[PDB]
Design a protein around this ligand. Structure first.
Ligand SMILES: *C(=O)[C@@H](CC)[C@@H](CNS(=O)(=O)c1ccc([N+](=O)[O-])cc1)C(=O)O
Ligand SMILES: [Ca+2]
Length: 240
């Protein structure tokens, strides 16, 4: 997250760190959202490489023991059947991870609330991105979880020629684009939390930023629209 602030320890309890085995240590690669005690929602592009993955729930500082973490392996990976790694712009950037063990819920570990199917946010709706991604374009990952206020940019504006044009689809949510605040590499897969009827709900799964850089004016961060995939999510969870 570029232009973020350190989140409080118990603000976003559905946020997880998706990590891969490197030698005899582990490395953060993406975020995700805990949606069931044994299921995580993330981006499909986060699992394109054939690596060994684990999920960390209750995490705040990647480089130190926080005394609240639970570490669990990934037992099954279900990517949307229409996903294509060579066309992130086609959409379908979503995947569900079945955990090897069900995690224990507490004030640091909670399920994310998802929107009702078909819900679209009005332009400029209040949302926050969270993650341990780069803190600057071509920078380094954050040690502590970061948050940034990123208001939505509706489809008509986002798909206009000076913004993302045809690259953005109605199956996606755009947010930010002020040139200062944005998601960045390593935030992919995590949540976009938006305030609706007094409750924060996870409306986006972080998907991409410009090739020019993370925080680029009129290139808002782009997310998979969770409310377009509610039937798919329920269908996968019910048949596994
Ligand atoms: C996500 O972090 C976005 C920017 C918000 C970028 C792509 N994702 S990534 O750099 O985290 C990533 C993770 C894992 C894989 N993989 O397993 O192939 C690939 C990329 C971005 O748009 O550059
Ligand atoms: Ca830690």
């Amino acid at each position: 997250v570029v232009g973020g602030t350190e989140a409080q320890r118990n603000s976003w309890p559905s946020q997880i760190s998706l990590q891969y085995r490197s030698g005899s240590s582990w490395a953060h690669t993406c975020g995700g959202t805990l949606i069931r005690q044994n299921w995580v929602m993330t981006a499909a592009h986060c699992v394109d490489r054939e690596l060994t993955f684990r999920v960390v729930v209750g995490e705040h500082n990647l480089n130190q023991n926080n005394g609240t973490e639970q570490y669990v392996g990934v037992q099954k990976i279900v990517v949307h059947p229409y996903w294509n790694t060579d066309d992130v712009a086609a959409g379908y950037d979503i995947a569900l991870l079945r955990l090897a063990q069900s995690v224990t819920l507490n004030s640091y570990v909670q399920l994310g609330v998802l929107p009702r199917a078909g819900t679209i946010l009005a332009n400029n709706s209040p949302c926050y991105i969270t993650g341990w991604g780069l803190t600057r374009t071509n920078g380094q990952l954050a040690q502590t979880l970061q948050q940034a206020y990123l208001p939505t940019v509706d489809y008509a504006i986002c798909s206009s020629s000076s913004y993302w044009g045809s690259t953005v689809k109605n199956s996606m949510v755009c947010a930010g684009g002020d040139g200062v605040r944005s998601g960045c590499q390593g935030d992919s897969g995590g949540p976009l939390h938006c305030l609706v009827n007094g409750q924060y709900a996870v409306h986006g799964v972080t998907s991409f930023v410009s090739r020019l850089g993370c925080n680029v004016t009129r290139k808002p961060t782009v997310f998979t629209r969770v409310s377009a995939y509610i039937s798919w999510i329920n269908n996968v969870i019910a048949s596994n």
